[PDB]
């Protein structure tokens, strides 16, 4: 008590433990991994079936924030939906009063420093949503930025969010990412969160994976269908 | 913020005010101010506490003030809240004199400063302004009055009051040797005398640690005079007098 | 504790005890199973009352000609929710001159309800929607849960002893979405009848509907008008 | 931004504002610092003890100005010395502003205690953690105030804030004189910062202001230290 | 103090609004019933002293000339959502040039109800739920209505209802003595025995306020001799 | 907008079978000053409706600004849906309306093509905001030129190929080119259709003056 | 005054006009016309010469401060969308033309124009000012694409000088300055200096 | 200066029978002295027993049929039930008020059946002042309208004529005529004509073609 | 338009043509002139209709609610403060509103005039319109606080037919209201062609 009831009070030592909650509330949720490579960068983000009743594509963790610029969510989805609104919003304001898509390192940095915001008063509660996003350009290439509750963005080669996480990481090391094919990358990727979900933990499971990158025209859309089903027979043969 | 508030500002189980308890104990042991009416004017008696001799004390009054041209006023407590209060009062009389074009009587200005203390009070969250106001003047409709209010809020009028450490004290001594209706300002003064140097016997009788204030009609024309220190040396000589011919004489 | 006496506070665990007690209160409310076929989708509720002299409240609200609503939890946020979407729906018709699709409805309530979550002394709305509307791509179920997640379902089952109506919605997913209008409904129906026990009947005259279709507005039925629904009904399982 | 509604500083049982006691005793633990007025003019003398000489002792200043008539030094949080000196500069200008004349030092510090007590009794706030001593001419004539973070005020011919603070009080009513000049005034405080200074003063550990009818002007080291040796 | 204004339970529903129940069941007994030729509203004075005047002990109130309301609970805080629904009431007459439906005017209540908190919405709002349970008996064009206002927000359109210190089980005999064909006159004379039974004293015509909407005549309450007439014969 | 500064003259506009034709000058006339002579007046809304503009020319900047950003944010939801022709109508007209009730209008008259659900659509909105639809519509001194003609000919054959909307768009062009002072001999024309929206870069019309000599 | 720019390959080139009147006195006859945004992107301004400043300074904020958040230089179509933004928002009562040029590593030496009322759009020669009007035959029958740097400042010069012989509100000297990739020059033509034309003797 | 007023022209009428309500206008857009279209009907049906006849300036007419759309859905919703001719004359009567510092320049008639299956035909003005009449015409040609109505549906001034309540086919065959007399004088309308009938049996829509000038 | 209003010993009388013109054009000869704010309660529109209509509804709006309130049916001249404060606070905003109203209360008889000017004067007798002037003549010479209720009757419609006659913005047929006690009565609807075929013979 004192010390964990609010975001805009330290620890004795000068820790935030509802940002360190938050965290907990975004590693328990589903797996969410984004590789970035020379020509794209790719989400694949883990859905829990509660019910063979949803639809696929629903309650979607992957957003489309700006013409060209994804956003890969992990924890609470509607606090993730929100953030994905406040991202849109952001690109919009920079599209009207600069006449471009907005880059997405300043996307990224202006999105951190609005839930960092959202880190500081007691009239409010840290976010309970990490979130990844990834864009293209002609003269900045490939880009992917990943954003923690807290409030801090780093650009990642390749990054995990979620239970599995680390273990996404390592085995995905031996992979030279950023130099690779995104459509290789695509198959790899449907490998790793394969292999990184557990079915004995979750036996109902399913794949959202889209990318964004110089074979999109620089604007990020959704994996075509069939390359979904070829992705799938790939990573069905690497379950081995 | 529901555990960090501080909540000044709510009931208490048994019915009273524990934050206006608390700024009336603390006026208690603050310091020490007399008023008392006579027939042709009314006198102040405020005790000064702090008396190092570093002070500059070029004032010409501490703890009383002059809230508008024909009414003077004795603060008891925290004399920041004090100043702020003193000014704000100030502030409303002009805007009654400006309003009305007429001095604006003592019981108007009271009332305001009690609707604006209990409103205070009443909400705002904030801890109650804990300074007794003691207030002396002259109007066209009763002339010379003085009023005592509360920081709860409430007012009375009064032909005499103490407020202070042994208010008790000082209020026996004006119930038993104040002549209503015959009191001119030699008795009155004599009687403030008196007080000072009873209801707070520790420390006896000085002349810098009090300052002393009359208010009197001449001409039509409300006059509000300090006692300099060598009229307070003054007082303080008769009042040794008159104790040594009493005591004589007993 | 001190975790479940505020929203803005974040529990050990990392939940909110709010949004806990709100999605409780969901599971408390009254029983509504809706479901959705390949044209139509229609909602089918049983209306509790404080007493049997009370007349079975409805819970399946009209929000707009081609969408409406089901509530399970507090009956004033509820209405307070509907209306802020059904004036979503006229501004849109206003606006556009279009039907506001589904989708988008849902997306909007979820990201108001998303407000409450993060804004300090201000509590979710401690009720569940099950959306069922029409638009150009075709009908759509919507579950949005106190908790200002929504989920896109084909059918389910909110409100106490709903676990037999999602097994029965399990079961017969499958078949769902190429059934008529009339065996829909009735689906549905027998869904409602499998939530209740058996002692207990799924009388015409404590039981709604709310059903739009291709060419069908959305339209709420009563006892009156559901007794045809109610025909050849097979007994309590 | 929300703001809190309700008062951080409150009534104790006893009456007594326990938090202003304990701003009270963090300016006691901060920095002490010392005033003394002449017969023609004032003086401001305050220890600057930065951690070891890595810190640019000249870069920082403690002694401020208000106007060309009025300097202040202060004891206790930088931090809240800042924030108060930049609203007093404020409140200085805006009374020049609307009357085209200097500033009477007692306004100005009435001001300041104003302003403090609407620090102490509003919501959401904490209480200034600082002492001032302020020095002011006007109408040919020195003034220096205290003014506490409990919001008052008062006209001190001397004052010693800060640790030791009582002794230093003691130690000046000692060596004060009515009718003193102001080089007895800076002797008498110099005299009393190395007296309490407890590590062997240095002229940039002394910085002084002097205020007269030529207005308020801080010493610089040369002149420091030239009176520090005229006085041993 | 510690628990807030918007603070659920660990089963899930707001404390506060039982606590608002609870003072319901603190109230006046009323009993409202409803039938083909009208509705009848009644309450039980529960008069404190007889020097205490009559006339301002009345807990049943006019909202239109065709609807009546009673009140159980904190009467005076019951004054301010009456008022607010006659003037919601004029206002949907003086905007569609027709008299208001009492649902629709119910409906409106409840909106008004269950509005408040700490820092929810402008300051100057409420900070408390209604604690007030209310019978909003009245003719419109779906002949007599009758309907249970729960403080809530949980609107009620039924045909019979008892709330107040007797609430239940009164309620439950009253039932058991209602029909689905009963004319007014029986309405009133079941109501009256009723609230007669329940009475925890000795009642008279100053120990109830009665009144009832016709289909024909406007809302119209039951002054001292037509109670004695309608009371002598029970 | 107090007066339109910078304006663009009239903009033609028809539709045909499965799709509609639009076309106006690449001109920006500065009052009688002609200072742009290749600026874009018709903005793409998207794949399915396009929009043609006259008046001034920095509040089209601005509505087609507003209208591309809202049409992102729209593909942006992912909806699997698309803003109907005649929504875009509907909410042009909206706008126009609130910015005139500010008194704070916008001097523009807009002509709305599209072509969706096999439905070719043909919109008009104008400053004032009046709004309706036509199978020919034209803006400014068009609506006195080619509108006539438009109708006519539309009158005569209810239903016209593509090339014979083109033709009939190109000859009153050239009547507009003829008889109105702020036209230009390049103009800029579009097609809505099926297969998404065409803008035919920067064409020219074909000029007759041989009655020049006929004066004496 | 009068302003006018032209782009060449790989940079720009823009020249003003040094007379500002208030009427027909002369406010100032040095007066500068073209201020550096960015180090190397200028504005050309005309019109309101309040109006101009506060446009350009407010401008000159907002860029540096988002050049600063991005770490990278800007580009010439922002700064011109921006002064897009900023007339359109304030036509009512800002009264300007502002000429918007200047090279960025993406795009190269690019020119937009601003005039009154809040437009934008890129002219590969754009002219503003009083005494515009006087010299668009003139850039027609001379200009020609693919031009180098210093042809383009010619002929750039030799327009504003038949623009400020030929306009009143013009006049004084005449400031050129050059930006690519090498920098920012700038030099003023001066009496002599100035191209001067025949003049019709008879 | 901008005018934020423009006068579109247009022609509305509408007469209410014992049992039935007809409402007709032209369907000619005007602007000056350009001719838009030659299909807009001014007559916009909101329930099927109540359509409303809204001239003038074409924006205001818009805006304000949206809004009597919304505003019907809204007490829809709220009353669970329709609204009478009576409640959306009302209604529109506040709307136009709620105006008043910037009227709507239109003319509006409000032709439906009541509960009682009688005609009724509400005639308002731009502030918004109401009132019910068997028969009113509004718009361009009100003036060339009224007189002949007054004569011929009210009988008004005329001896030994018995009061034949109208039907149907006299309506009709009248706003027929009435309409063919106004598009020859008027230049604000003709070339067209939609009429709704508005009946027991529902709402009827018919056109007639007009002086196609 | 012409509305005229007078009191006398069994109540008051109120009179007003059916004529409404828009410009130098007749708009309707039917307009319901007179305005039952209440059962008991009259009022009036001239000059705008339509602000003198819904001035005239708000006043039945806010009087119900008063009356509701305070269990009391509401005074005239407290009907009448509330309406000249409602109109007055939008003063010189375009408002052109008038009337008269009448009605029976604690008082007796009591008549009220209020306009858009916020000019609330009682009296005797008054009336407002384009005929108005002319009607003052025939009221005025006319008018005796004893007279009978049909004198009463009479005496208004002659005025209200003197007033439409020689004016041209007054005409269609007199509405006739007569207040007493209780409320009011609708004394007649005549056509002022029937009424001038009368007075001449």
């Known amino acids: 008590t004192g010390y964990d009831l609010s975001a805009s009070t330290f620890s004795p030592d000068g820790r935030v433990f509802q940002v360190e909650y938050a965290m907990k509330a975004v590693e328990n949720s589903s797996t969410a991994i984004g590789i970035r490579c020379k020509d794209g960068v790719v989400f ?197 | 913020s529901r555990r960090y508030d501080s909540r000044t500002t709510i009931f208490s189980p048994e019915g009273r005010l524990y934050q206006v308890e608390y700024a009336m104990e603390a006026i208690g042991h603050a310091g020490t101010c007399l008023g008392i009416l006579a027939n042709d004017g009314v006198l102040l008696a405020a005790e000064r506490r702090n008396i190092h001799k570093l002070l500059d004390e070029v004032f010409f009054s501490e703890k009383i003030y002059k809230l508008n041209e024909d009414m003077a006023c004795s603060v008891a407590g925290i004399t920041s809240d004090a100043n702020v209060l003193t000014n704000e009062l100030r502030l409303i009389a002009q805007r009654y004199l400006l309003q009305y074009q007429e001095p604006i009587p003592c019981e108007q200005l009271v009332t305001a400063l009690c609707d604006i203390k209990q409103a205070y009070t009443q909400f705002g969250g904030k801890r109650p302004f804990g300074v007794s106001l003691l207030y002396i003047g002259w109007d066209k409709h009763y002339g010379f009055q003085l009023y005592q209010s509360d920081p709860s809020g409430n007012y009375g009028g009064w032909k005499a009051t103490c407020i202070g450490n042994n208010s008790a004290a000082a209020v026996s001594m004006l119930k038993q040797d104040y002549k209503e209706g015959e009191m001119t300002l030699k008795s009155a003064l004599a009687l403030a005398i008196k007080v000072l140097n009873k209801t707070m016997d520790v420390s006896k009788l000085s002349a810098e640690k009090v300052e002393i204030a009359t208010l009197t009609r001449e001409n039509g024309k409300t006059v509000i005079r300090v006692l300099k220190q060598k009229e307070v040396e003054q007082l303080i000589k008769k009042h040794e007098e008159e104790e040594a011919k009493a005591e004589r004489e007993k | 504790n001190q975790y479940d006496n505020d929203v803005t506070v974040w529990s050990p665990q990392g939940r909110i005890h709010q949004i806990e007690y709100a999605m409780e209160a969901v599971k408390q409310g009254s029983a509504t199973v809706g479901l959705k076929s390949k044209t139509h989708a229609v909602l089918v509720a049983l209306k509790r009352a404080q007493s049997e002299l009370a007349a079975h409240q409805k819970k399946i609200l009209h929000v707009d000609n081609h969408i409406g609503i089901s509530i399970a939890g ?84 909110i409100g106490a002893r709903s676990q037999s109506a999602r097994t029965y919605l399990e079961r017969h997913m499958s078949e769902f979405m190429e059934c008529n209008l009339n065996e829909l409904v009735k689906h549905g129906l027998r869904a409602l009848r499998e939530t209740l026990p058996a002692e207990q009947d799924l009388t015409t005259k404590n039981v709604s509907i709310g059903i739009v279709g291709k060419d069908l507005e959305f339209t709420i039925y009563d006892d009156d008008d559901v007794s045809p629904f109610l025909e050849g009904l097979e007994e309590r399982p | 931004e929300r703001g809190y509604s309700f008062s951080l500083t409150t009534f104790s049982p006893s009456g007594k504002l326990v938090q202003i006691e304990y701003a009270l005793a963090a300016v006691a633990g901060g920095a002490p610092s010392v005033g003394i007025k002449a017969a023609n003019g004032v003086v401001l003398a305050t220890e600057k003890k930065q951690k070891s000489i890595l810190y640019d002792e000249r870069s920082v200043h403690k002694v401020e100005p208000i106007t060309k008539h009025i300097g202040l030094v202060y004891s206790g949080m930088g931090p809240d010395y800042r924030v108060l000196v930049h609203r007093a500069r404020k409140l200085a200008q805006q009374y020049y502003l609307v009357y085209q004349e200097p500033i009477p030092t007692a306004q100005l510090v009435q001001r300041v ?109 040369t002149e420091v230290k030239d009176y520090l040796a005229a006085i041993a | 103090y510690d628990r807030g204004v918007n603070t659920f339970s660990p089963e899930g529903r707001l404390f506060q609004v039982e606590y608002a129940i609870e003072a319901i069941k603190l109230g006046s007994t009323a009993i409202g019933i409803q039938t083909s030729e009208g509705v009848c509203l009644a309450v039980e004075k529960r008069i404190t002293s007889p020097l205490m005047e009559p006339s301002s002990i009345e807990k049943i109130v006019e909202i239109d000339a065709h609807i009546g309301c009673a009140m159980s609970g904190l009467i005076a805080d019951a004054k301010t959502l009456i008022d607010k629904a006659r003037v919601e009431t ?81 309620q439950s005999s009253l039932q058991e003595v209602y029909h689905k064909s009963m004319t007014l006159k029986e309405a009133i004379k079941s109501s009256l025995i009723i609230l007669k039974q329940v ?31 309608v009371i002598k014969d029970i | 907008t107090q007066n339109p500064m910078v304006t663009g003259t009239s903009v033609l506009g028809v539709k045909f079978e499965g799709g509609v034709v639009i076309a106006a000058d690449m001109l920006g006339s500065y009052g009688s000053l002609a200072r742009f002579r290749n600026i874009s007046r018709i903005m793409r809304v998207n794949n399915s409706t396009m929009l043609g503009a006259s008046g001034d020319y920095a509040d089209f900047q601005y509505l087609k600004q507003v209208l591309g950003q809202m049409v992102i944010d729209e593909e942006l939801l992912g909806d699997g849906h698309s803003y109907s022709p005649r929504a875009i109508h509907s909410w042009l007209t909206r706008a126009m309306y609130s910015r005139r009730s500010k008194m704070n209008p916008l001097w523009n008259t807009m002509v709305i093509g599209g072509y969706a659900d096999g439905e070719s659509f043909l919109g008009y909105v104008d400053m004032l905001g009046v709004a309706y639809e036509a199978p020919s519509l034209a803006t400014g001194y068009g609506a006195y030129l080619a509108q006539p003609l438009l109708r006519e000919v539309l009158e005569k054959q209810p239903v016209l190929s593509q090339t014979e909307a083109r033709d009939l768009v190109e000859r009153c062009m050239r009547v507009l080119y003829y008889r109105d002072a702020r036209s230009y001999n390049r103009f800029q024309i579009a097609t809505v259709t099926e297969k998404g929206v065409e803008i035919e870069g920067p064409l020219s019309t074909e000029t007759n003056w041989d009655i020049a000599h006929m004066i004496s | 005054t009068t302003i ?42 005309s019109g309101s010469a309040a109006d101009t400043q506060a446009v350009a300074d407010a401008v000159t904020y907002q860029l540096g401060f988002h050049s600063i958040e991005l770490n990278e230089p800007p580009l010439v179509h922002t700064a011109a969308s921006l002064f897009k933004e900023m007339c359109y928002r304030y036509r009512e009562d800002l009264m300007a033309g502002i000429i918007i040029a200047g090279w960025d590593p993406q795009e190269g030496g690019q020119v937009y124009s601003v005039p009154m009322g809040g437009m934008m759009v890129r002219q590969s020669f754009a002219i503003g000012g009083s005494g515009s009007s006087y010299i668009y035959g003139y850039v027609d029958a001379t200009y020609r694409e693919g031009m180098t740097k210093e042809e383009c400042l010619q002929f750039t010069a030799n327009a504003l000088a038949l623009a400020m012989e030929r306009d009143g509100s013009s006049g004084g000297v005449i400031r050129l300055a050059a930006i690519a990739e090498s920098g920012v020059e700038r030099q003023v033509l001066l009496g002599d200096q100035i191209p001067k034309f025949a003049v019709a003797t008879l | 200066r901008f005018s934020p007023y423009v006068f579109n022209g247009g022609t509305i009428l509408a007469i209410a029978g014992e049992d039935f309500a007809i409402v007709a206008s032209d369907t000619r857009l005007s602007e000056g002295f350009s001719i838009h279209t030659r299909d807009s009907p001014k007559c916009y049906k909101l329930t099927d027993k109540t359509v409303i006849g809204c001239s003038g300036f074409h924006g205001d007419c818009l805006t304000l049929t949206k809004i009597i759309e919304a505003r019907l859905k809204m007490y829809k919703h709220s009353n669970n039930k329709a609204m009478t001719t009576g409640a959306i004359a009302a209604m529109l009567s506040t709307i136009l008020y709620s105006r008043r510092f910037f009227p709507y320049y239109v003319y509006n008639i409000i032709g439906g059946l009541d509960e009682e299956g009688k005609g009724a035909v509400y005639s308002f003005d731009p502030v918004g002042s109401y009132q019910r009449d068997s028969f009113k015409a509004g718009g361009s040609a009100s003036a060339m309208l009224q007189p002949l109505l007054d004569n011929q549906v009210g009988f008004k001034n005329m001896q030994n004529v018995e009061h034949v309540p109208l039907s149907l086919d006299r309506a009709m065959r009248l706003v027929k005529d009435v309409f063919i007399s106004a598009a020859e004088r008027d230049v604000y309308t003709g070339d067209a004509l939609r009429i709704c009938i508005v009946t027991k049996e529902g709402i009827r829509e018919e056109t007639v073609s007009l002086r196609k000038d | 338009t012409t509305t005229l209003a007078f009191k006398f010993r069994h109540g008051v009388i109120v009179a007003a043509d059916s004529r409404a013109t828009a410009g130098a054009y007749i708009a309707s000869q039917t307009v319901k002139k007179v305005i039952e704010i209440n059962p008991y309660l009259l009022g009036t529109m001239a000059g705008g209709a339509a602000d003198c209509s819904f001035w005239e509804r708000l006043l039945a709006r806010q009087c119900r609610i008063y009356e509701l ?22 003063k010189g905003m375009g408002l052109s509103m008038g009337t008269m109203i009448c009605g029976w209360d604690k008082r007796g008889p009591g008549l009220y005039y209020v306009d858009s000017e916020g000019n609330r004067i009682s009296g005797a007798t008054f009336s407002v319109g384009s005929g108005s002037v002319y009607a003052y003549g025939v009221m005025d010479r006319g008018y005796s606080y004893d007279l009978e209720v049909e004198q009463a009757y009479d005496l208004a419609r002659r005025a209200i037919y003197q007033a439409t006659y020689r004016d041209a913005y007054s005409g269609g047929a007199v509405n006739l209201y007569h207040v007493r006690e209780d409320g009011w009565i609708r004394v007649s609807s005549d056509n002022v062609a029937d009424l001038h075929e009368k007075y001449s013979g």
Not at chain 1, 96 to 101: I, K, M
Not at chain 1, 200 to 213: I, R
Not at chain 5, 204 to 221: C, D, K, R, S, W
């Open chain 1, 44 to 240: 694949g983000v883990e859905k829990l079936v509660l019910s063979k009743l949803y639809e696929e594509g629903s309650n979607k963790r992957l957003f489309n924030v700006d013409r060209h610029v994804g956003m890969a969510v992990a924890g609470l989805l509607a606090d993730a939906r929100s953030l994905a609104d406040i991202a849109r919003e952001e690109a919009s304001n920079f599209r009207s009063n600069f006449g471009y898509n907005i880059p997405l390192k300043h996307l990224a940095d202006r999105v951190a420093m609005y839930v960092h915001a959202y880190t500081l008063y007691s009239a409010v509660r840290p976010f309970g949503c990490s979130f990844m996003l990834g864009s293209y350009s002609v003269n900045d290439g490939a880009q992917l930025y990943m954003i923690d509750p807290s409030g801090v963005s780093y650009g990642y080669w390749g990054c995990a969010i979620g239970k599995a996480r680390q273990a996404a990481k390592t085995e995905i090391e031996k992979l030279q990412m950023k130099e690779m094919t995104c459509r290789d990358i695509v198959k790899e990727v449907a490998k790793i969160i394969y292999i990184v979900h557990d079915e004995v933990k979750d036996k109902a499971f399913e794949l959202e994976l889209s990318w964004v990158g110089e074979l999109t025209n620089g604007r990020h859309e959704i994996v075509p269908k069939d390359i979904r089903e070829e992705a799938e027979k790939y990573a069905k043969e690497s379950l081995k």
């Open chain 3, 74 to 157: 507090l009956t004033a946020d509820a209405r307070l929710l509907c209306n802020f979407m059904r004036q979503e729906c006229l501004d849109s018709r206003f606006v556009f001159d279009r039907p506001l699709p589904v989708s988008r409805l849902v997306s909007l309530i979820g990201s108001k309800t998303q407000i409450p979550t993060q804004r300090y002394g201000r509590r979710p709305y401690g009720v569940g929607l099950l959306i069922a509307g029409y638009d150009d791509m075709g009908p759509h179920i919507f579950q949005t849960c106190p908790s200002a997640n929504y989920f896109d379902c084909r059918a389910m089952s």
């Open chain 4, 113 to 221: 205690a104003s302003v403090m007590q609407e620090y102490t009794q509003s919501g959401g706030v904490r209480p200034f953690g600082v002492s001032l001593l302020i020095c002011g001419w006007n109408e040919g004539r020195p003034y220096l105030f205290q003014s506490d973070p409990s919001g008052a005020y008062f006209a001190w011919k001397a004052t010693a804030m800060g640790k030791n603070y009582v002794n230093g009080k003691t130690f000046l009513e000692k060596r004060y004189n009515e009718d003193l000049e102001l080089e007895d005034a800076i002797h008498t405080a110099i005299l009393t910062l190395k007296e309490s200074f407890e590590g062997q003063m240095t002229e940039d550990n002394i910085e002084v202001g002097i205020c007269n009818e030529a207005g308020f002007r801080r010493l610089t080291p």
């Open chain 5, 90 to 170: 004029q206002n949907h007459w003086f905007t569609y040039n027709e008299t208001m439906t009492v649902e629709s005017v119910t409906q409106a209540v409840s909106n008004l109800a269950l509005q408040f908190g700490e820092e929810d919405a402008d300051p100057g709002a409420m900070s408390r739920p209604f604690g007030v349970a209310l019978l909003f008996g009245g003719v419109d064009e779906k002949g007599p209505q009758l309907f249970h206002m729960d403080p809530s927000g949980t609107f009620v359109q039924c045909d019979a209802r008892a709330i107040g210190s007797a609430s239940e089980g009164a």
């Open chain 5, 199 to 229: 009475m925890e004293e000795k009642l008279n015509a100053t120990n109830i306020e009665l009144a009832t909407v016709q289909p024909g005549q406007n809302f119209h309450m039951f002054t001292k001799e037509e109670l004695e007439e």
């Open chain 7, 4 to 45: 006018m720019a032209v782009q060449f390959d790989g940079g720009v080139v823009l020249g003003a006009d040094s007379r500002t009147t208030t009427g027909s006195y002369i406010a100032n006859r040095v007066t500068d016309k073209l201020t550096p945004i960015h180090d190397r992107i200028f504005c050309c301004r």
């Open chain 9, 69 to 90: 309130r305070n269990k009391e049916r509401i005074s005239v001249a407290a009907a009448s403060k509330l309406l000249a404060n409602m109109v007055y606070q939008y």
